[PDB]
């Protein structure tokens, strides 16, 4: 992907900590170096082809240095509880067509005007209860929204039994009517899903949606049928792809601006971050001002990424290597 910068940004992956310039042996290590006079901070990182230092931060010219966990970089997949409006009708009426429209708002473009509309429909009959309705509508949407012919994964739809009320029984286009065997269904949850991701060519993005209901005649007046409340999210997309697309961008400040343009002739810059791991991010945002009449500041920032093992062990040990060496109070996360 492509991000915005405050006049530069450069990333250093902190895979291991060595605290001295002689122990930098394998790829991806970091050493935050500073002298005893607390005025200069730089990071000597062992790249895959030699020891590379950072821009020398003047510690009287830092602006903010805050470190962020990996649970704050997870886009939560929102849910939508599709139910019958019980004030309209407690049981489904035996004549009307019960059609539900999903209004997707960013289908293949970025703009809210590149829309997509997908549907599911039940003809309700006599004696059909609500649980036989939700069993018959989650298949009528899974044949549409979770089919094997579709270009992209649109949504993940589920059913919830009233006895369990917390776990979801997932419905797919191949799920038959005898697979969903419960007489106590009470809602249909439609959840956002993880779109595809390519390193650098296709960023991480999401297609939003709103379930909207079509009008049925109850008594003699055409009323709305359903209600759709936003249930709190349960599934979160991890931090592996936002940092790989961030490193792939920020390696081009210190390196080749083209990435693979012209392929007999590319410089294979080796990337160190794993897209299958969750990462903590620390940004030290600083500037430059000379002792002259040129008092305008040139803002810069340095991003340090490190692997999270659940308890933020590698980042809080990296912060403690920066705070004692440089004399800033980066808050441990």
């Amino acid at each position: 992907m492509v991000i915005s910068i405050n006049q530069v940004r450069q990333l250093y992956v902190a895979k291991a900590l060595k605290a001295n310039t002689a122990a930098l042996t394998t790829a991806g290590d970091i050493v935050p170096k500073a002298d005893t006079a607390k005025t200069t901070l730089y990071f000597q990182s062992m790249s895959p082809a030699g020891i590379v230092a950072s821009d020398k931060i003047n510690l009287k010219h830092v602006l903010y240095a805050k470190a962020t966990p990996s649970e704050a970089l997870a886009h939560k997949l929102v849910r939508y509880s599709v139910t019958l409006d019980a004030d309209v009708s407690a049981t489904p009426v035996a004549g009307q067509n019960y059609i539900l429209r999903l209004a997707f708002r960013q289908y293949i473009g970025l703009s809210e005007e590149d829309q997509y509309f997908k549907y599911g429909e039940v003809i309700a009959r006599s004696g059909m209860t609500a649980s036989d309705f939700y069993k018959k509508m989650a298949i009528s949407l899974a044949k549409n929204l979770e089919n094997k012919t579709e270009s992209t994964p649109l949504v993940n739809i589920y059913l919830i039994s009233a006895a369990a009320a917390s776990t979801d029984v997932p419905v797919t286009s191949a799920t038959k009517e005898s697979d969903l065997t419960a007489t106590d269904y009470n809602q249909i949850i439609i959840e956002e899903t993880e779109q595809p991701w390519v390193l650098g060519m296709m960023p991480q993005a999401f297609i939003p949606f709103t379930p909207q209901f079509l009008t049925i005649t109850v008594d003699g007046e055409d009323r709305l049928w359903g209600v759709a409340t936003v249930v709190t999210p349960t599934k979160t997309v991890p931090d592996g792809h936002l940092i790989a697309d961030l490193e792939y961008f920020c390696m081009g400040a210190r390196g080749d601006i083209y990435r693979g343009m012209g392929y007999p002739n590319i410089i294979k810059t080796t990337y160190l971050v794993d897209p299958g791991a969750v990462y903590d991010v620390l940004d030290i945002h600083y500037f430059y001002t000379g002792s002259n009449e040129s008092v305008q500041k040139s803002e810069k920032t340095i991003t340090l990424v490190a692997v999270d093992d659940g308890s933020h062990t590698a980042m809080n040990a990296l912060i403690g290597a920066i705070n004692t060496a440089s004399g800033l109070t980066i808050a441990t996360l």
Partner: protein
């Protein structure tokens, strides 16, 4: 679809045409079969009777 109703077809084709097409560009020529021409006949016969 499981069962064809024009409430599904007129709202598949109004939401598509309002979001993607202009006003005078909403002519939809539907290709179908012989049994689908009678199925299109029976739903609007239920609509026009309404």
């Amino acid at each position: 679809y499981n069962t064809f109703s024009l409430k599904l077809l007129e709202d598949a084709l109004y939401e598509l045409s309002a979001s993607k097409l202009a006003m005078d560009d909403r002519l939809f020529v539907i290709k179908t079969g012989e049994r689908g021409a009678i199925q299109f006949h029976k739903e609007v016969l239920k609509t026009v009777s309404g």
